[PDB]
Amino acid sequence: HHHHMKVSDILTVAIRLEEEGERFYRELSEHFNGEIKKTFLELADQERIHAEIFRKMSDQENWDEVDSYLAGYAFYEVFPDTSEILRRKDLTLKEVLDIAISVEKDSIILYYELKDGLVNSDAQKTVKKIIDQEKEHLRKLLEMKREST
Numbered sequence: 001h002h003h004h005m006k007v008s009d010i011l012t013v014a015i016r017l018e019e020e021g022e023r024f025y026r027e028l029s030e031h032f033n034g035e036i037k038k039t040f041l042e043l044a045d046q047e048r049i050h051a052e053i054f055r056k057m058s059d060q061e062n063w064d065e066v067d068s069y070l071a072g073y074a075f076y077e078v079f080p081d082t083s084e085i086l087r088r089k090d091l092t093l094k095e096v097l098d099i100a101i102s103v104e105k106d107s108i109i110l111y112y113e114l115k116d117g118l119v120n121s122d123a124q125k126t127v128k129k130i131i132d133q134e135k136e137h138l139r140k141l142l143e144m145k146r147e148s149t
Helices: 007-028 035-060 093-117 121-148
Strands: none
Touching: 007 035, 007 093, 035 121, 093 121
16 A cells, blocks of 8 residues: 555556446345435446546556556555345345445545546546545435435
């Protein structure tokens, strides 16, 4: 590792969080039923689009930017292994949301870290858009927790 993370290391991390998030939310939608199913699927499509933006970015950002060190400790957790619980046929919305909320918060910190490491002001604006959308996913997750849990 978390010291001497490069910008490019962090984009790779961010790409995977968005890809894994897509999968999580799409797989979660198999456990649930209504407006809730629809929500998880929207969240999955949104995460998809985000990953496509981050992949394009790691390809097209200038090498000197991307190859630069973020000073200090770059926090991140890679997406949890969820294969076992997602095998279960009796999952509650609560336990699922608790997990979603916790990894979403972990991923938000990381996208902030990334934004701070970008030097190109277009790249930073692109990532702020994603962060804002991620923070709305989070609000939706807390809304579902509060309401239907």
